[PDB]
Amino acid sequence: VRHIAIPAHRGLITDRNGEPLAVSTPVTTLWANPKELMTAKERWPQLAAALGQDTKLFADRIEQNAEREFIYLVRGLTPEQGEGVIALKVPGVYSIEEFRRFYPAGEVVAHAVGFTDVDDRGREGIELAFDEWLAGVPGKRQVLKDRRGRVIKDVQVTKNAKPGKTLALSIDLRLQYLAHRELRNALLENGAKAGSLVIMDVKTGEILAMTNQPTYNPNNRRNLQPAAMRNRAMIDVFEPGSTVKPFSMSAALASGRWKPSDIVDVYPGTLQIGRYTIRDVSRNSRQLDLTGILIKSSNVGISKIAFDIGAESIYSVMQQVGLGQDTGLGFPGERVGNLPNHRKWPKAETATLAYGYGLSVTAIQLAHAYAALANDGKSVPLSMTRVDRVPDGVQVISPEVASTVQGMLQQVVEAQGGVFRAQVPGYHAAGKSGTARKNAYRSLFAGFAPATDPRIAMVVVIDEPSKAGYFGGLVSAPVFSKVMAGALRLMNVPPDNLPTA
Numbered sequence: 001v002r003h004i005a006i007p008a009h010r011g012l013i014t015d016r017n018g019e020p021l022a023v024s025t026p027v028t029t030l031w032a033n034p035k036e037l038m039t040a041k042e043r044w045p046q047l048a049a050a051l052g053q054d055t056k057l058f059a060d061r062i063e064q065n066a067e068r069e070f071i072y073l074v075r076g077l078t079p080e081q082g083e084g085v086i087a088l089k090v091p092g093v094y095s096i097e098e099f100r101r102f103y104p105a106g107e108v109v110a111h112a113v114g115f116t117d118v119d120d121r122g123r124e125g126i127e128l129a130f131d132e133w134l135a136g137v138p139g140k141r142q143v144l145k146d147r148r149g150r151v152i153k154d155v156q157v158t159k160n161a162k163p164g165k166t167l168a169l170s171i172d173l174r175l176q177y178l179a180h181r182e183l184r185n186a187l188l189e190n191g192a193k194a195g196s197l198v199i200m201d202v203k204t205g206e207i208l209a210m211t212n213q214p215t216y217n218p219n220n221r222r223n224l225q226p227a228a229m230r231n232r233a234m235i236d237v238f239e240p241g242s243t244v245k246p247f248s249m250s251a252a253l254a255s256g257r258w259k260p261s262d263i264v265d266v267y268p269g270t271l272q273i274g275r276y277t278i279r280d281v282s283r284n285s286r287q288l289d290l291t292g293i294l295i296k297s298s299n300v301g302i303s304k305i306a307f308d309i310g311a312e313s314i315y316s317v318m319q320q321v322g323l324g325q326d327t328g329l330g331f332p333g334e335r336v337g338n339l340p341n342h343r344k345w346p347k348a349e350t351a352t353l354a355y356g357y358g359l360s361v362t363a364i365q366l367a368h369a370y371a372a373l374a375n376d377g378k379s380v381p382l383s384m385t386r387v388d389r390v391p392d393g394v395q396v397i398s399p400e401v402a403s404t405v406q407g408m409l410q411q412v413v414e415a416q417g418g419v420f421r422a423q424v425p426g427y428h429a430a431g432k433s434g435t436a437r438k439n440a441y442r443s444l445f446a447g448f449a450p451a452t453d454p455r456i457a458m459v460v461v462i463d464e465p466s467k468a469g470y471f472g473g474l475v476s477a478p479v480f481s482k483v484m485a486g487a488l489r490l491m492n493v494p495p496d497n498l499p500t501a
């Protein structure tokens with residue numbers, strides 16, 4: 001190979017407020033013309049010691065590659081330790097100015113930001129997703145070697161090295177830290193295997209925080225546990241269970257056949273359907289209104305509304321809000337999940353769809369779906385980059401129905417027997433708990449706040465809590481409350497649980 005390629009400066013990644021998240025750091029790459037190195041053998045041990053390498057093992061490497069015009073001695077050294085080797089003044093030893101990524105918030109935004117490979121190319125998260133934007137264009141310089149490898153003339157610059165472009169993520173580091181800390185605390189308190197937590201701006205489609213457990217320090221390029229590198233929020237599919245009942249309810253209110261004050265008889269708390277039996281955990285109910293179906297998380301109640309309205313209307317809401325659908329984010333091997341579909345829905349499939357057993361979604365899809373519900377039935381496109389001009393948004397649920405489902409969800413949190421642990425002191429919060437049997441469990445809470453003018457949608461997913469209580473309303477709901485209280489105050493969202501008398 002004739003001429004050498006000048007490495008380009010990788011674009012700076014910031015959070016939405018300009019806080020540096022991934023920074024291109026100058027590293028020194030040392031290489032050698034082994035033809036020339038062979039003429040300074042007395043120098044070789046010093047060189048070997050200055051590179052941590054074994055004296056004899058290093059001499060073997062050079063002797064082997066003695067014919068070559070180029071070989072790499074060592075990549076990624078600090079410029080100052082690169083200086084130290086250059087300070088030896090060993091003939092046939094040359095250097096390349098290179099770039100390596102430094103991630104100032106480390107493990108805190110590991111999954112969202114991602115990391116680069118040995119060649120400084122995006123390998124995970126944003127780094128991989130916006131690789132072309134961030135990479136820029138490498139340089140080219142005309143070198144004149146006599147024959148061996150003497151740096152003679154550089155007559156022309158050939159082609160200038162183009163730097164990569166800056167990217168400001170939709171992430172707020174302040175909210176990222178709180179979500180990070182609280183998710184880590186939840187895991188240790190519950191002895192859980194994993195977890196995810198997504199925060200979103202219902203008005204802009206911006207992902208304000210996305211955290212997962214386990215995490216890793218992307219500045220520590222050794223050990224690298226692939227399980228700790230998994231961006232679970234985007235790559236781990238799960239059965240959403242009861243967190244999908246607000247969408248089945250939206251289909252009910254939209255059909256013209258149901259109103260919140262209507263009653264469903266759920267007695268004896270079981271419902272037999274051919275070969276399968278739908279079951280509720282608490283089976284001390286007869287008549288329940290639609291809000292009561294949500295408060296008690298009645299599978300029987302929601303399956304009965306489903307049979308009346310038809311599964312097709314339920315499927316449609318779920319599909320339109322983006323459950324089991326492409327996010328448009330175009331992230332590294334991001335999972336799409338599965339929303340089952342039929343021409344003729346059998347009774348057993350209609351019920352399971354209505355209560356979330358028949359389906360695979362990601363934490364990001366669930367949050368986005370709750371975002372459209374919170375934003376008065378308008379789905380705004382998801383973004384991982386700061387949104388200055390907000391795109392049009394799509395009315396996926398009528399405002400009236402969305403507003404009604406919001407009120408019911410507020411009552412899920414605030415009513416007697418409700419998910420009190422989800423209460424956000426100073427504000428009116430809304431949401432719905434979920435618990436999915438995988439015995440192994442997954443604990444879920446999805447919600448939004450402030451009910452008066454929803455601003456934030458949040459999903460808390462805790463995988464395999466090993467403590468006595470495994471229910472979403474018990475394991476996830478306190479995390480929602482904790483993160484919500486802080487995120488809203490960090491955004492200076494004024495408190496809404498204000499007087500009226």
Ligand SMILES: *C(=O)[C@@H](NC(=O)/C(=N\OC(C)(C)C(=O)O)c1csc(N)n1)[C@@H](CNC(=O)c1cc(-c2cc(=O)c(O)cn2O)no1)NS(=O)(=O)O
Nearest residue numbers: 239241242281282296297356357433434435436437472473
């Ligand atoms: C929704 O997610 C729904 N969960 C399920 O039906 C699923 N599994 O349920 C459990 C209990 C985990 C099970 O082992 O079967 C499910 C859906 S998809 C999938 N793969 N698994 C509801 C079920 N309801 C309850 O957990 C629940 C608890 C109570 C209750 C009532 C009461 O009066 C008191 O005092 C206390 N409790 O706990 N009522 O219903 N889970 S959810 O409620 O978390 O949404």
